[PDB]
Design a protein around this ligand. Structure first.
Ligand SMILES: OC[C@H]1O[C@@H](O)[C@H](O)[C@@H](O)[C@@H]1O
Length: 437
């Protein structure tokens, strides 16, 4: 059973900044035989092996992969199997494929044919991952990635008829894109996504972004936040999480509190909200649609049916607009949630329940499509304070294992690593946030 394989994945870690670089050690990490034993001792069961093959394969057909690089990957797989561990071999970075899928398709398929035919006789502890974090042109048209992964799975199944293949959506394997993912009817598929929300914390001070985001961002389970997948598009207003509620200062006429979700939600019929003071508002759940005028009163809930403010089939935009030509004094939005025949959705929450909501969306998609879930990457950069990193990592791990998700932390050493190669010591708070045995 594919579910049994995905459960045998369990807990794992990434050997990052290694083989996914232009060459091994180019990004700081060279693979050593002792890392596998350390990972086996720490309590993990799986090792995800980021490998970028585009640097070690011919540019012209038949696009042969360099045999020495193949020997390196064979050494990695053998060290993983010798220590009772699973190993996920993937196609990681591939800028030529993401920038031009049509032209690079033949080379990608030949690379995957070589990889599959080489490891066709490996036991069930060896997993395949077609493409890590598809982006670029795959974001422009996820059907390109759907067709390409269909072709790649065809190629793989030509020699591996029942090996677990790990497939993910576009948008850098964002779960908020699972809705656009289309898989064939193959029984042995494992859906994957990478969780790095919020990006303001997990990637703070990441020198490879442009803009490199500010540093010193704190993360706590009580730190106020919006619902997962909802961005703040408010215009002309000071919107800020002060305490457990949300302070809103309408700074000009017809300014509005705006929450946008690229993914969207379905199955909700009315929106409920409560403010600290009486405010006049225009409520809009559909942009370019008739908003509804509602007058508030302090400490008093207000529920407006979505049918009377836009009536959207898929709720993507939500606007509480200052129904006034002038500015207004600051107030506190203390509640904001959507309700329907099923469970509600708290749009105001903390980072903890935001992680919870993200995992709930992922689990709903997984159950409706009947696919096991393996979170391939999650972690916080070292530029954040260690306490916040430990709290975030523990929260994500707990909410992943609540949803029966197999996961692979990012990463083992260096940047997001849990092992300090300099001191030869485990970063114990992070390790216990991962494995509290
Ligand atoms: O140098 C560190 C490297 O980290 C990786 O995770 C990024 O994808 C690269 O863009 C970067 O160069």
């Amino acid at each position: 059973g594919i579910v049994e394989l995905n459960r045998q994945l369990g807990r794992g870690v990434n050997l990052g900044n290694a083989l996914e670089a232009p060459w091994e050690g180019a990004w700081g990490v060279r693979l050593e035989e002792g890392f596998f034993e350390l990972i086996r001792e720490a309590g993990f069961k799986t090792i995800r092996l980021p490998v970028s093959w585009t640097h070690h394969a011919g540019r012209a057909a038949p696009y042969t992969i360099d045999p020495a690089f193949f020997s390196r990957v064979d050494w990695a797989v053998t060290q993983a199997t010798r220590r009772g561990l699973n190993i996920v071999v993937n196609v990681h970075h591939y800028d030529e494929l993401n920038a031009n899928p049509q032209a690079e398709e033949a080379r990608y398929l030949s690379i995957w044919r070589q990889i599959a035919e080489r490891y066709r006789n490996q036991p069930g502890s060896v997993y395949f991952e077609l493409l890590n974090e598809p982006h670029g042109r795959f974001n422009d048209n996820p059907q390109l990635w759907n067709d390409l992964l269909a072709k790649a799975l065809r190629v793989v199944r030509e020699s591996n008829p029942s090996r677990a293949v790990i497939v993910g959506p576009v948008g850098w394997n964002s779960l908020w894109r699972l809705s656009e993912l289309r898989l064939p009817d193959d029984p042995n598929l494992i859906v994957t996504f990478h969780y790095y929300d919020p990006l303001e914390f997990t990637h703070q001070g990441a020198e490879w972004l442009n803009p490199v985001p500010p540093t010193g961002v704190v993360w706590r389970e009580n730190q106020g936040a919006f619902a997962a997948g909802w961005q703040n598009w408010s215009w002309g207003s000071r919107v800020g999480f002060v305490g457990e509620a949300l302070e809103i200062t309408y700074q000009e006429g017809w300014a509005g509190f705006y929450l946008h979700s690229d993914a969207g939600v379905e199955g909700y019929d009315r929106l409920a909200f409560r403010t600290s003071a009486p405010v006049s508002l225009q409520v809009s759940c559909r942009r370019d649609a008739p908003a509804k005028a509602v007058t508030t009163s302090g400490g008093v809930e207000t529920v407006v049916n979505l049918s009377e403010c836009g009536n959207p089939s898929r709720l993507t935009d939500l606007i509480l607009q200052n129904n006034s030509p002038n500015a207004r004094a600051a107030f506190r939005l203390e509640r904001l949630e959507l309700r329907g025949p099923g469970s509600p959705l708290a749009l105001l929450t903390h980072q903890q329940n935001a992680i919870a909501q993200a995992m709930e969306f992922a689990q709903r998609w997984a159950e409706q499509n009947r696919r096991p879930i393996f979170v391939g990457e999650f972690g916080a950069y070292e530029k954040g304070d260690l306490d916040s990193r430990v709290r975030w990592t523990g929260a994500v791990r707990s909410e992943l294992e609540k949803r029966n998700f197999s996961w692979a932390y990012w990463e083992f050493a260096a940047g997001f690593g849990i092992y300090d190669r300099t001191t030869r010591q485990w970063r114990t708070p992070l390790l216990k946030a991962l494995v509290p045995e």
